[PDB]
Symmetry: C2
Subunit: 396 residues, 2 copies
């Protein structure tokens, strides 16, 4: 018998989803992590102290590294102890944020399609998710891209009331690949300031922005530092999704409440992973300048792979939406229980290729508007994408 | 402002407890080496690319398979790795899953005092009402003071159960007392849980650390209890790697699913390389469970020696130790020292003053037992200080130097 708070929250999209099938579904990198990330974990393993309890809110060496890296991005001095919290992934950071800040009866605005945990997390806190969809614009004629999706500022305004506690922002966006523009962020900022709401900004894909786009942090916009929690992830930054380390960065008067959730929930994150992650950070922080920096080299490597996926999807009559950022690409499926779920089962069984139906990232009323869209992951090794080529070449 | 569910829960004893020349017998920080193979296995896992990516949400398959094998032997029943186990971020996370998945606002949860400090705020964050009952000492055998001289009154316990009781939290072996609950004590608890149809959440992280004359009994193995108990263990304790932060909840499928629902909506998955390495460590020791060199046997054997040394050290200065049946903490009554605390003028309990004094004057820290007590219980336990002995010989040598030079 569940507690009331988790009523109806037991179904989970990922819980629902053959070894000759090429999996382009889940965000499971099969490229290697950088060699030094692995080496540093090995080194921490052999130090006895690095196997025992560390500082609860974050390993001192790690919060110092994050302080120094993010202080450069933000152009401010970030207090490593008071303005940072290390949690169990971005998931954990998100949970800390909602649990510590959002009351039963609060409204939380979510942009659709949304990364799927946003909705049940808001609901577990007894809050009301208030949905607004991203919508299409006329294309430049040439190609379909993430930047051809935006939101209507007037519709957004109408979502804000005196019940609104916060808006959840995700840039670069999953599943669309949208890198939100400065002007878009400014509309969100104006409304958070005018209504005095929080912004929770999920920026795990922050390094993964392609040619002609720039990651901009809403927390750097005038008046936003004081009302924003910005979230990062080791799993994305260093392609080690299995390390489950993320962080929240923001003002002390907000971070302390995340800290209260953490000390009362899981308390401490793993010492060896955090020690190794601190060293991985120092290596790359010292060479941000250079194309060898993993912050530089990975987006560069992935852009090639993105462009590859777009050719392959085109090659078979699937209309790709070229992503500004991240490592997912959506394809419209229409020119070949919701449509995209049926299509994905059909493509698995008959083409030996798997993907994720976009309707999984949509509230019930929005699903008809997105149900002909399917998402593919390209943070894959050359050999994996060749196996995918084979499947596409052989499709007809 | 904070969310309402966390009002007044921002204070934390461990945060409150913050110098290189101080000998630290306070926090449960092991400075013995963990087993060599535990460290080896994490290194091995680090170099496998796959073991650095997402694994199964509710627990890495090899880990839960190892857990089901080991606990199947202990429970003498088949344990389902997927449906009857949930791997969480430490025993903390397991406790959190349990209370968050199973306990409603207005529910009562019975807690035994002193209690591992997190029990109280976890119950309050869920909007539930902690109902406290103290452990009470009884006359000693004359020669020694032990954990076994502490117990609860069964009639007092009974009176805490009402139609509003959702659960009782059991911690055995007990922190901070070191008490190993007897079959008869567990039987009293089981009787009431069955009579009122309540849950039992049983924190058994120290399950392997039981000393001569005592045996770890799992309440969930008693008649009627399997269907109503969540039993919690921890890698930090099992393998002396407190920094790995992996624990597990074991119980019936209809209860574990609720815990699994909290986890999927909170942090989701635990780290892959730690879980992979831990599985291997378990196999290495599962396969030699009958042998002295099994870590499950050698660690309590090694700790029993250290415990006895600590008892002697505390005695030499006039501290009155409570010899623990289990775990790696020891409590001493400090009141026969009548210490020079005259002018530390706060409204803090005696034991916190004593510890501050001991740290400054004697260069030795410990933990005040009142940190493990609710407001009304503090005066009944405030002359008691907790010392940790999961320590290497050289650390206890340093401690011994201080005790010898004490007067
Ligand atoms: C937008 C978004 N946020 C959060 C997460 C979870 O991050 P973590 O693995 O660090 O918990 C993911 C998973 N790839 C994601 O796509
Ligand atoms: C009784 C008890 N329960 C739970 C914990 C926390 O366990 P973990 O470190 O596995 O989260 C501790 C701390 N050692 C403890 O003493
Ligand atoms: Ca307002
Ligand atoms: Ca308050
Ligand atoms: Ca079975
Ligand atoms: Ca009842």
């Amino acid at each position: 018998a569940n507690a009331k708070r988790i009523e109806g929250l037991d179904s989970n999209v990922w819980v629902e989803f053959d070894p000759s099938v090429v999996n382009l579904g889940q965000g499971f990198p099969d490229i290697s992590p950088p060699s030094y990330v692995k080496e540093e974990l090995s080194k921490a393993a052999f130090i006895d102290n690095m196997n025992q309890y560390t500082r609860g809110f974050g390993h001192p060496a790690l919060v110092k590294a994050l302080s120094c890296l993010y202080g450069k991005i933000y152009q401010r001095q970030i207090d490593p102890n008071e303005e940072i919290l290390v949690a169990v992934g971005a998931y954990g950071s998100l949970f800390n944020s909602i649990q510590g800040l959002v009351d039963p009866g609060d409204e939380v605005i979510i942009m659709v399609p949304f990364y799927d945990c946003y909705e049940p997390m808001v609901r577990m806190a007894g809050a009301v998710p208030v949905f607004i969809p991203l919508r299409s614009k006329p294309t430049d004629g040439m190609k379909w891209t993430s930047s051809d999706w935006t939101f209507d500022p007037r519709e957004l305004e109408s979502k804000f009331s005196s019940k609104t506690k916060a808006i959840i922002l995700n840039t670069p966006h999953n599943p669309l690949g949208k890198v939100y523009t400065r002007q878009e962020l400014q509309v969100i900022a104006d409304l958070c300031v005018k209504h005095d709401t929080l912004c929770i900004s999920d920026e795990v894909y922050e390094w993964l922005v392609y040619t002609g786009h720039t990651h901009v942090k809403i927390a750097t916009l005038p008046g936003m530092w004081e009302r924003t929690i910005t979230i990062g992830s080791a799993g994305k930054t260093f392609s080690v999704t299995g390390w489950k380390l993320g962080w929240s960065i923001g003002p002390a008067h907000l971070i302390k409440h995340l800290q209260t959730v953490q000390q009362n929930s899981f308390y401490t994150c793993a010492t060896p992973l955090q020690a190794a992650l601190a060293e991985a950070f120092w290596i790359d922080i010292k060479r941000m300048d250079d194309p060898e920096c993993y912050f530089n080299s990975l987006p560069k490597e992935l852009e090639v792979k993105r462009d590859r996926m777009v050719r392959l999807l085109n090659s078979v009559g699937l209309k790709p939406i070229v992503p500004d950022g991240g490592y997912f690409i959506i394809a419209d499926v229409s020119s070949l229980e919701p449509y995209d779920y049926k299509f994905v089962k059909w493509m698995t069984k008959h083409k030996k290729l798997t993907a994720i139906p976009v309707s999984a990232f949509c509230d019930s009323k929005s699903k008809p508007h997105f149900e002909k869209l399917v998402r593919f992951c390209f943070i894959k090794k050359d050999s994996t994408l060749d196996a995918a080529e084979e499947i596409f070449r052989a499709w007809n």
